[PDB]
């Protein structure tokens, strides 16, 4: 916990097989491999701390030692791979797992819903991303509802999703805590753009490769509604 300095930034690519997120977000623009590697190394550090916790046989005895360690840190979770120990970490060590500043959840299994939609706490800022979505099922939306809801504030990143066109408004309406929204080369309807321009709790907005070229009821006609927009 005393050590804060990173040190060497070479190698350490064993973790997170999707090192470049498997043809997803953090693409060619604004890569900065050096910062990506830091995030990976930090995540491994956090996991190591969790492993030490699991083997410390001190579930409640050493709550402070296992609080300071994680405070100010971030954790990455792949919805396609959720190790059993994650549940013990979050459920057996409350008021510590929540000390993390950020959780990064990519992609919907009910297991992801179970881990997040818990009683433990409403986690500060959740960063959630969607990749493999050619379709959005009602059950998927229902699950997202539960996942989005369990947070103080939300950051959402949607990339190359085909099932989202005409469904983005619906999904976004599930939770108004979203302040940061970006869409990567994913088609949207005017109704989706209207929803976005109509929500004034946004601070960050990023529009990539939207070629409707006709958005009267939308951002190209106004976008003066988002008074809280800063980015």
């Amino acid at each position: 916990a005393a050590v804060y300095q990173h040190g060497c930034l070479l190698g350490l690519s064993i973790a997170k097989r999707p090192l470049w997120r498997q043809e997803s977000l953090q693409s060619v623009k604004n890569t900065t491999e050096q910062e990506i590697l830091k995030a990976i190394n930090i995540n491994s550090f956090v996991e190591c701390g969790i492993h030490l916790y699991q083997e410390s046989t001190s579930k409640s005895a050493l709550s402070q030692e296992f609080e300071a360690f994680f405070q100010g840190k971030s954790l990455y979770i792949n919805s396609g791979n959720i190790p059993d120990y994650l549940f013990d970490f979050f459920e057996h060590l409350p008021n510590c797992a929540s000390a993390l500043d950020f959780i990064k959840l990519d992609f919907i299994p009910s297991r992801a819903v179970s881990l997040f939609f818990n009683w433990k706490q409403e986690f500060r800022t959740l960063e959630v991303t969607l990749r493999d979505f050619s379709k959005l099922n009602k059950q998927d939306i229902r699950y997202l509802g539960k996942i989005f809801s369990s947070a103080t504030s939300l950051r959402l990143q949607i990339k190359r999703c085909a099932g989202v066109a005409g469904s983005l408004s619906l999904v976004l309406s599930t939770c108004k805590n979203i302040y940061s929204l970006m869409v990567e080369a994913s088609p949207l309807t005017i109704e989706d753009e209207r929803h976005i321009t109509s929500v004034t709790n946004l601070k960050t907005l990023s529009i990539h490769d939207l070629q409707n070229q006709r958005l009267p009821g939308g951002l190209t006609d106004s976008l003066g509604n988002l008074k809280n927009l800063t980015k």
Binding site: S110, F117, N118, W119
Partner: protein, 257 residues
């Protein structure tokens, strides 16, 4: 006296009241689940709350008592002091109910023993709920309050939130509600009233039909979990899924529908 689901000929109400006029030792008067008697109940309330007696526990419920009979009771609140639990719940006043209630509200200034007070339902009593507050805040012994069988709005929730500001009673344990028109911002609008009500035993908070917001599910479970008692609480008409029921804590019991 305990009379339960006994059918009357619409005449005996008078004779019953006449017999009661000679009984002063009556301490409990329980008369509930009555048929369509209508007239004659006005005579009973005329004979009662008069000719001072030791009746402390009055439980007239589900009888279709006329608002005019309520007006009689209002006029006679000066009598039968020591009576503490006026009920008149599960009773609908088709008209003038809010006026009869208004008169009741501005009275009772001589009844310091009052507790566990249930309200009559009228069209529309919602307009006088802010008037109830005038005396409710003055009675630090109101263990329970029953406000049933009418729709509540978010405005009313906020008004109650002011009631639940609050000037503490420190003796409140049971609240109820038969139905409402409730949303996320109220229910949520009135939260922060459980911290100053640690001794809550139970509530109904029923609704015609509502699908609980996930924020409600999490907040409700955590808030109820930290309560001292939470003994046999109900939450009727709420569309909880299996995942939400799992989140809800090991309460003594829970009725969802």
């Amino acid at each position: 006296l305990i009379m339960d689901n006994i059918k009357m000929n619409e005449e005996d109400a008078i004779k019953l009241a006449e017999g009661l006029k000679n009984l002063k030792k009556m301490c409990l008067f329980h008369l509930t689940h009555l048929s369509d008697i209508g007239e004659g109940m006005d005579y009973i309330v005329k004979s009662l709350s008069s000719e001072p007696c030791d009746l402390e526990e009055i439980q007239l419920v589900s009888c279709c008592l006329s608002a005019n009979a309520v007006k009689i009771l209002a006029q006679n609140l000066h009598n039968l002091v020591k009576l503490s639990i006026l009920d008149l719940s599960e009773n609908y006043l088709e008209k003038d109910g809010n006026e009869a209630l208004h008169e009741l509200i501005d009275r009772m200034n001589v009844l310091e023993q009052l507790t566990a007070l249930m309200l009559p339902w009228g069209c529309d009593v919602q307009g006088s709920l802010s008037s109830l507050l005038k005396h409710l805040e003055e009675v630090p012994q109101l263990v329970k309050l029953g406000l049933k069988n009418w729709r509540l709005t978010d405005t009313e929730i906020r008004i109650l939130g002011a009631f639940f500001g609050k000037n503490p009673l420190k003796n409140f344990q049971q609240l109820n509600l038969a139905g409402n028109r409730v949303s996320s911002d109220g229910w949520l609008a009135f939260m922060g009233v459980f911290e100053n009500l640690k001794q809550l035993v139970f509530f109904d908070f029923s609704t015609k039909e509502f699908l609980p917001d996930p924020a409600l599910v999490r907040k409700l479970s955590q808030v109820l979990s930290k309560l001292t008692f939470l003994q046999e609480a109900r939450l009727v008409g709420w569309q909880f899924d299996d995942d939400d029921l799992s989140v809800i804590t090991g309460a003594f019991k829970l009725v969802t529908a």
